[PDB]
Amino acid sequence: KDLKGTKTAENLKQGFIGESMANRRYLYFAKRADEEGYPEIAGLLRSIAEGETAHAFGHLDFIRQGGLTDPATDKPIGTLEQMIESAIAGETYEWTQMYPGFAKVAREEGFPEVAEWFETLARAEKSHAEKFQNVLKQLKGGT
Amino acid sequence: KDLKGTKTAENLKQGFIGESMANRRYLYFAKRADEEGYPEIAGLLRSIAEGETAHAFGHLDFIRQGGLTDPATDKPIGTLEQMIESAIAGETYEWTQMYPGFAKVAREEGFPEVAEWFETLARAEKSHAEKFQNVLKQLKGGT
Amino acid sequence: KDLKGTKTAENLKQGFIGESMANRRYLYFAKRADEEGYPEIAGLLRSIAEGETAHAFGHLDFIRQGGLTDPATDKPIGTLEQMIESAIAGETYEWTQMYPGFAKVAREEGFPEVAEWFETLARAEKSHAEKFQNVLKQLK
Amino acid sequence: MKDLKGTKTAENLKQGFIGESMANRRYLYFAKRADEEGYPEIAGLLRSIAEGETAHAFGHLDFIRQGGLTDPATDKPIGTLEQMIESAIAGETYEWTQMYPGFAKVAREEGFPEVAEWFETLARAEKSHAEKFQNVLKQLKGG
Amino acid sequence: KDLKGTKTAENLKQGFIGESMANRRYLYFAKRADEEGYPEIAGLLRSIAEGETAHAFGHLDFIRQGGLTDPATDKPIGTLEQMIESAIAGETYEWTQMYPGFAKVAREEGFPEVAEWFETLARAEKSHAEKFQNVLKQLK
Amino acid sequence: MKDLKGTKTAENLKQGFIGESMANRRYLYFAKRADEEGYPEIAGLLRSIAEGETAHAFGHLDFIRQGGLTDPATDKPIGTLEQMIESAIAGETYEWTQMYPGFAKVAREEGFPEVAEWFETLARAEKSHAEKFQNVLKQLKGG
Ligand SMILES: [Cl-]
Ligand SMILES: [Cl-]
Ligand SMILES: [Cl-]
Ligand SMILES: [Cl-]
Ligand SMILES: [Cl-]
Ligand SMILES: [Cl-]
Ligand SMILES: [Fe+3]
Ligand SMILES: [Fe+3]
Ligand SMILES: [Fe+3]
Ligand SMILES: [Fe+3]
Ligand SMILES: [Fe+3]
Ligand SMILES: [Fe+3]
Ligand SMILES: [Fe+3]
Ligand SMILES: [Fe+3]
Ligand SMILES: [Fe+3]
Ligand SMILES: [Fe+3]
Ligand SMILES: [Fe+3]
Ligand SMILES: [Fe+3]
């Protein structure tokens, strides 16, 4: 049966989002355990984080094998070239819309240190977009 | 000013979600570059993934320093103990509600291989919850 | 002392093969532990794998010190330039002969998906050979 | 798929796995020489190509397992986690009870006492690994 | 040949300090490159850092082979048991004397947040000392 | 905060950084001995405690930078990415033009020719590092 347009397609997407966050959160928590001298706690958080990597990648396998799109971009991710095109689309959204819009709202609401951070991130994602565009030109057979 | 109840609080949350997904996606794409013999593409994806780690952790710093909750659980993450309690709450949600509910829907919709995966993940998150509960008992001064 | 023609020369080569396989096997097994929710088991597999890295590298130390060749390629691996030349030799054998031959036999025996995997790898090792060839100019 | 047992393709998957396993170890060993001598581009290329050879080795193991073939190193099944630990125990046991003590005896007879001492250190290490894996297996079977 | 009392003994110790600092510095700098969107710069910092690891480890090889002590603790580091005893010695000096003394001076000079950081580290190194003490029984 | 320049606390942050830097290197070196001998629990403890000493070193650098102090290794500022690369160039330059060639001359005079050859290999490596960092700095300033 086709996964397109099913509740299961949406559930694979939401599963991916949650697993992605769990890995990031557990590695961030491990640095607090590190500073305070809890190596066994830090090691458990890092080992469980590898479990959450495996879960995230398995969600993406069912997504890709089912012909579903990338949770982050709604672009196909069947081939390497499509994977780089998904990277470019996400970076482009972040520097041309998401982070400048967040920075404007942070300045309006009275949070200039947060706005400066969002402005730093917009410049970073613009750089990432350009580096991925240069890879895509080489994959397609150019300089 | 207090970040609680602001558009900027919500934007930090959404920024964290996107950065988490970007790191997972780029490491997954790097394994396709690896198999096909593109070490420079794989290396770029892994180096840009470190950038997305830095971005995710900086969002969590502004969240924690502002007294906002964990994007994944809506629990506080100021202290190590609160961080482990956030881990336990997320694992508990996944094995007692999220993954069993996804498995039931996958079976109803005619996707038994996806349901078996969700059932495997529910058993994994139950194990993770128990391991974190054992750490929390030790942090609080017990065996 | 010179290891040429001894049983110990062959035993170091077989030791290197087994230690290389053990690291790869234990990291593969760790991913199964990861998905199923066994973080202590996965962490032990990963720490024991570091032991098998140390074992493999020490066999290569004795091979090089005893004037023996690279177990994979039968080329000398004394200097960094020699090491990159051994890498190029192995990659060239794999893309020009080994993987295409594996793919032909897999097609003949009725394993079409395994044949396509061998063809993907033949293309990959050609790419690896190119990248190594383009750094030789740094080593003279 | 057809059964792989007894075919030349079965033998080729095993030899492929051996060569890929050696390539990763060789390239990481070479990278440490490039590190000490001041060639960071070459070192990073060796490390990225080594990730390629990991992907290749793991893909060979995927086909081996999916076609009901045994572990190239031990001739034991590797379908379940318990079977994977039993294969680790069988390999460690062969190494400390037969392979390394036999190698050490021959090294001493042939006039290589420092190589014999190395093989004796390795036999003690694999004995220790075997005991640690046997303790894990007991925990797995006990729930 | 015995390095005791030579200028080369002291030079190996200063080499080890500088190489240790260089690895930490370059990985810290890499995180700034990461946040700002410079993946080529971050990757070069990380690869050069691997070079400084190889340099530090080779200085420790010559220190141990020449019968010298651990640069950090002045304890021998020949055997694994000695290595864990050196770790315990350093951790014990840091929690019983060094970090509490740093915290007292920081309070005296008017740096309250830096004092609290030194106190967090004194507690951390006490924990490290305990964990190492509890593995000694494995080494006899 | 008060200015840190010229205080004992400034000197203590520098010595703290030196000790933390050595602890990480020492513990990773010890872990390789535990690896070869068959002590994976001890090896993993050394590796996890080493992550603790990374967190400690980086926190010392945070206070150093935030209080306008210079890099402990070079006495150069490390506030911006460009300053961080200039500090890397100054340290590499000192090492290949003064420190390692002087060490090599003394080793040869004192009868340690293999130690002298090592110091000469290191001088060539740091020369190579200095050139690679100078190329990065040129790219940074040029946009
Ligand atoms: Cl702990
Ligand atoms: Cl490439
Ligand atoms: Cl477990
Ligand atoms: Cl290079
Ligand atoms: Cl860059
Ligand atoms: Cl152990
Ligand atoms: Fe999970
Ligand atoms: Fe990005
Ligand atoms: Fe980002
Ligand atoms: Fe979990
Ligand atoms: Fe081994
Ligand atoms: Fe290759
Ligand atoms: Fe390969
Ligand atoms: Fe073993
Ligand atoms: Fe160095
Ligand atoms: Fe410590
Ligand atoms: Fe410390
Ligand atoms: Fe350097």
Coordinates of C-alpha atoms in Angstrom, one line a residue, chain A residues 20-80:
Chain A
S20 CA 16.1 14.4 16.6
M21 CA 15.4 16.5 19.6
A22 CA 16.1 13.6 22.0
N23 CA 19.7 13.1 20.7
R24 CA 20.4 16.9 20.9
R25 CA 18.9 17.2 24.4
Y26 CA 20.9 14.2 25.8
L27 CA 24.2 15.4 24.5
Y28 CA 23.5 18.9 26.0
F29 CA 22.7 17.3 29.3
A30 CA 25.9 15.2 29.2
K31 CA 28.0 18.4 29.2
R32 CA 26.4 19.4 32.5
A33 CA 27.2 15.9 33.9
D34 CA 30.7 16.4 32.6
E35 CA 31.3 19.8 34.3
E36 CA 30.0 18.5 37.7
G37 CA 32.0 15.2 37.7
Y38 CA 29.4 12.6 36.9
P39 CA 31.2 10.4 34.2
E40 CA 28.8 7.5 34.5
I41 CA 25.7 9.7 34.0
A42 CA 27.4 11.5 31.1
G43 CA 28.3 8.1 29.6
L44 CA 24.7 6.8 29.9
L45 CA 23.3 10.0 28.2
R46 CA 25.8 9.6 25.4
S47 CA 25.1 5.8 24.9
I48 CA 21.3 6.4 25.0
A49 CA 21.8 9.3 22.5
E50 CA 23.3 6.6 20.0
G51 CA 20.0 4.7 20.5
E52 CA 18.1 7.9 19.4
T53 CA 20.3 8.2 16.4
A54 CA 19.4 4.7 15.3
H55 CA 15.7 5.5 15.8
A56 CA 15.9 8.7 13.8
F57 CA 17.7 7.0 10.9
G58 CA 15.2 4.1 10.9
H59 CA 12.3 6.6 10.6
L60 CA 14.1 8.2 7.6
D61 CA 14.6 4.8 6.0
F62 CA 10.8 4.1 6.1
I63 CA 10.2 7.7 4.8
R64 CA 12.7 7.3 1.9
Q65 CA 11.7 3.7 1.0
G66 CA 8.0 4.7 1.0
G67 CA 8.6 7.7 -1.4
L68 CA 7.7 10.2 1.4
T69 CA 9.5 13.6 1.5
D70 CA 12.1 15.0 4.1
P71 CA 10.3 16.0 7.3
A72 CA 12.2 19.4 7.4
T73 CA 11.8 20.6 3.8
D74 CA 9.0 18.5 2.0
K75 CA 11.6 17.7 -0.7
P76 CA 12.4 14.2 -2.0
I77 CA 15.6 12.4 -0.5
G78 CA 15.8 9.3 -2.7
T79 CA 19.3 10.1 -4.3
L80 CA 22.4 11.9 -3.1

